[model samples]
Target chain A: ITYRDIVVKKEDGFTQIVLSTRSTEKNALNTEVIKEMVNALNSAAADDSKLVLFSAAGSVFCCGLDFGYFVRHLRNDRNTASLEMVDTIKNFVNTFIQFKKPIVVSVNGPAIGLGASILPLCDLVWANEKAWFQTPYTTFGQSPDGCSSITFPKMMGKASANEMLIAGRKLTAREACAKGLVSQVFLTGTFTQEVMIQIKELASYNAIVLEECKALVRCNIKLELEQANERECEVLRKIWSSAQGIESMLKYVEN
Target chain B: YRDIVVKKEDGFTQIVLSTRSTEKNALNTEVIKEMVNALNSAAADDSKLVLFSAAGSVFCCGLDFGYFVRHLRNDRNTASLEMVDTIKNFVNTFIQFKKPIVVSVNGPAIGLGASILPLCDLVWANEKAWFQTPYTTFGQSPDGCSSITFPKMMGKASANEMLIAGRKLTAREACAKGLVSQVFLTGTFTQEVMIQIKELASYNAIVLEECKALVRCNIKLELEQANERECEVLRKIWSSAQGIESMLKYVENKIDEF
Candidate 1:
């Protein structure tokens, strides 16, 4: 199947969704891109594919939101447009979390903010040495979103989560692997080939057993995500309109 | 100083409960009462943190078997209730205490020691420290809210390994299993790592307090319910022949040392 911003291909009995961020330097989750990604996921689910690999073709994975567009909308009093964009992005995250098929995310480049948070939901994540992960939500006077509030603590413990969220630290591939976040890290130039090999091997496992085990481990997590999303949305909306958020955003843009 | 020592610092207090006698740090009535008093006093004073540690090689060696045998032969109900009450007070105080508590486990933290360590805000153990909840080995159920705390902290597989199989978890293994916060260097270095705990206590007090309260609010009711059920089952099993035999065997081994 083909879409405007998402390219779907099937090879080796697995479906691959290559997300295109409209040729931007960093893939940003704008409204059109989110709609295309969600539509692709729904169509893929209908096809009952055994495996889905989400990857991007750019220097950096999804760069969260387009700050330029966000600022313009905020200034123009387009509150409904901003809310619609956020809801669309959240739906994509929910679909990824609850999708029955096993997911293997190939971190081709830097995964910042939402990019880093989304990788944790995948069953297997492979990152290159050049790929770094970070979430600066708190620096922007916002709490973590994208199920990070639940997923980060479960993976790295409460203390580590506090350090990450409060300090706004970035994690290298090796560091993330040590922390049990990444399944494997490939050499700088060999990441793409390594991910392909790993995904192919994973696909060799019994599809039924793999899917069942994935669901068994993630059922509680999905429930947590559903509840946390509502709480996060409420908190984010409040922060988005606050003076602290405005000051942080202005500083971020200046830097 | 007594076998167990208590020290006070500026922001927090340290209660050093010892089994320094080369043998076991047996949990007798007197020791249990002293522990209760120490915890209660700390709670009352509004100490920002409490550190529970040992003076000897081992953290604790479970309850005194000799005491158990004597009480079992005379009046089992009264003895069991006394011991359970003491433990309940200690654990309950630790749970509801306003400030953070750090448990510095040096060697073996078995039975009740293993059970209560989870109540601490942070647990730092030496590489040589090991943990085991061997209630099932004695044909009895768990105590000290372990049935709830263990599974919630370390997940089912790890909790079962300690409670059901009565397996010993090494410090390194515990760190991997998320049973303990971190494992430090063993021997003399243990003390140095312990000092870092006070630094953690000096962290943002309000955030720490709110975090603890939030955690307690979420889990306290369910944990207490589980603990009540566990105690009821354990008391019934304590009267069984198997439990009696196990206690007798434990006493025999201890007396053989003399």
Candidate 2:
């Protein structure tokens, strides 16, 4: 009946959504948490807010999937679980990809797996000095989600993108900024205040201008992103259905 | 053939513009017509890709202001519309080109020349070659869809600096900003570009074309619309009396600046 995993606050000009560790560890996302996040976003989209400010609560921005919960679901219903999981994730990612207004991500700390991959879908990404990023999909025996397969290569070139996607290269805040992944990096001492100021100024602009400008920037890739999302989800459904994939994921979680 | 040269080699088509009528290979109706004809021929030929290059100390100085100023003096309305129409078609050719366009900038590229580089698949520049788009300086808004391509390539801040403030970038600076893919020393620019071109031409034609289609499909429609909007803006500006006066003044003083 009530929001449990996320805190959604509709401010004067923008809606702020924070991923809280209410029922998950390290803000890791499961199917329920992802649905809640999507609901918050949809509400924000229909509201008067001009944009969204996505952040997290704990020292870790996010640690990707909650393996414990995900493993249980797969174990209980291995036949249909993968299909449901993929469908939910596909919709969750599409919400961000096709989002009309701009999205501003504030990475307070380390953002891993799905958390890190989602940055490219957002219009603007602000990172704290202590923030870091990685997409270790191979470790989980999974393919990429969130259209990172394309957006990452477009932003930082193919070599760098492959390193992160395949080799699981860890990037510090500065590295991410230099690679065009993060829009800007703020001081850890006043990270929250800095992001707040920027988003407020952005929200003050003409709502039409904000939306149209984002459309101009995003119109080129909207279809490509959607197509990539479908393809990635298809691949994910196959992998998550296999016993070998489950074993690999469980092994990573155990370590 | 009068203004540009088209060489269809074993596996590639080389379109070289060494214009003698318009100074510095500046594009006019005649030059653009020649280029379009050559490109259309290449499109229908057996060549795998296009190697677009120029012959001069200045690769291209952009619009033929001398020719346009003279014509605008005769008939502003007719001449302006015709000129804008020609530019729209010329840019559209590049946008709809199926095969990859590998541009070799031998010298400085200014105005629309620099603006159109992003339309091509690959851009290689000489070490001494610099780039600039002084559209506002010549009393015009951006053309060739640089309005969209520039910001996408190098972000809005740097793109605006070049578009609004008329900032000039050296070859190294352009490469660093992602505008240029590679910069070779002037001494071996031709040799190095040809070496790479030969390798590219050797690849399977279907593979190359398909790759370009997949990558460029993302922005093809957006770029087409941008080109239309840009040409409309140019038509409006050029047709106006004040814009004609500003351009005349710029050309009168610029007869000495070349």
Candidate 3:
């Protein structure tokens, strides 16, 4: 585990990057973890040799930010730490925006916070029968990241997006598929075997066709996504440690 | 049958436009103006849904080629410019429309017929219905914002296959490809679409509108402008002697074959 908090293995033509969140930590987006994820993604792109498929270990995909750490920083009035934290979060999300190769995600468990935010940016998403998607970013009094503010409505619909982002609704696997947030949902009994089959199949496709087709669709994204991310983070920075943000966090903790 | 019929009740509006030509209700200047006026009125309505259906079996055979059949024989260049302008405004309006439009495809939808389907919120087609975009076959360029909408919903290969290669899609295939929402048995097609639309209108009007607006929000400007580009190219091709030869050779009067 060279600096490994995750597993990165290259196969025929696709690299499998499994989140190593099996410890009591489960899957939390702490500063160190965020840095590692960004680094891993950059290195995978540097390989220039394979598509990256993301999945997580254990049943829980990710529970979102490590609120405890952020809370401590807020209490101490660590301005530089706060700035670096937001900057790292920005860097983490934007890394996927400019990623060179297709990134396919297999959501076999709960994907909350950052986990939920990143789904729209992936090339394709496969889910377990029981996999559920939740985007409770507003639960902690934050805006949105991963450009979901603009994209979620377009990907799903205004009602669903508002329901999820504003009312804090959670989506089941089937609902997510119907809404275009998830591509396919494999049955719980055989998801891994099925996903393995899909993984190999996608990697075996003519690389040029895969690249060129994605190029046509993405050519339009242009600067739209970049500008959207910055806009989201601007509000996010204000809310991450403000009085309202801290109050929301404390309320959830008390519950 | 009247070329256009309108009905409003139960908080929704329905427009049943008929294609009079048995061979193909080739679009004409009159139909274009009527359609534009109907859509504008519907947009101004606070109705929850616009039920757009066709009276006869043929939903729309595309441009009443009778326009070309009769007009092109007159002024060559001017006719091409007029047709393009009419169609451009027609399609651009569909893209910018505020309300959700649910289509009931009664029969074959060709050219403009097929391209407009993707712009609607939901489309229900009969088992006997089919979609074909043969602009390329007639040596014409694509229009109706199909260039942008098709690729977004169906993907690049499928879009190019229909727009560039001029493939014809069956009712079931169109549903599978995401152009049509679902297919109904021939006997029950209209009832199914009407029933679903009736219940669908139950949503709060503002929410329904907001959802539709957001879906089209990112590309509204692009779609409107893209139609102009399509027309700019189409005017050139449709004005040429080659365009005259293509239309003159087509036995458009051979109706009911569609």
Highest DockQ model number: 2
DockQ-based CAPRI category assigned to the predicted complex of candidate 1: incorrect
Supply the TM-score for candidate 1: 0.53
Q: For each candidate, give its TM-score against the true structure.
A: 0.53, 0.62, 0.60
Q: Is the docking of candidate 2 incorrect, acceptable, medium or high quality?
A: incorrect
Flag regions of model 3 displaced more than 4 Å: A1-3, A22-24, A48-50, A250-255, B1-124, B127-178, B187-221, B224-258
Over the stretch B1-258, how does candidate 2's per-residue lDDT look in tens digits? 788988888889999988988888899889999999999999999999999999978888889897898998799899989999999999999999999999999988989889889989999999899999876567677788887897677644355446644668899979977889999999988899999999999999999999989988998998998888778767777888867876887787855223
User: How displaced is residue A8 in candidate 2, in Å?
Assistant: 2.4
Stretches of candidate 1 exceeding 4 Å from the true structure: A242-247, B1-258
For residues B1-258, write the lDDT of model 3, one tens digit per residue.
Answer: 246788876868998887453345557777777878999999888798798898877898887665575677688888888888888888877888889998899899998888888878889899899998766455565668776676567543355446543567899978866888889999877877888888988889989989898888977888876677778767766777766666765535344457
Better of 1 and 3 by DockQ: 3
* Tens digit per residue, CA lDDT, model 2, A1-255: 258998888898899999896778889999989999999999888999978889898788988888788877887777699899999999999999889877888899989989998888887778998899999988777889989998888777889999999998999998887776776778889998888887786676445435644565565678998999999999888888888878877787788
How do the candidates rank by TM-score, highest first? 2, 3, 1
- Model 1, A161-213: lDDT tens digits are 77677788888987776555665578977778777776675565444434543
For model 3 chain A, the run of ten residues with the poorest summed lDDT: A208-217
- Candidate 1 local lDDT, residue B175: 80
**Candidate 1's DockQ:** 0.02
- Share of native interface contacts present in candidate 2: 0.01
- lDDT tens digits, residue span B68-95, model 1: 7677656567666665666666667776
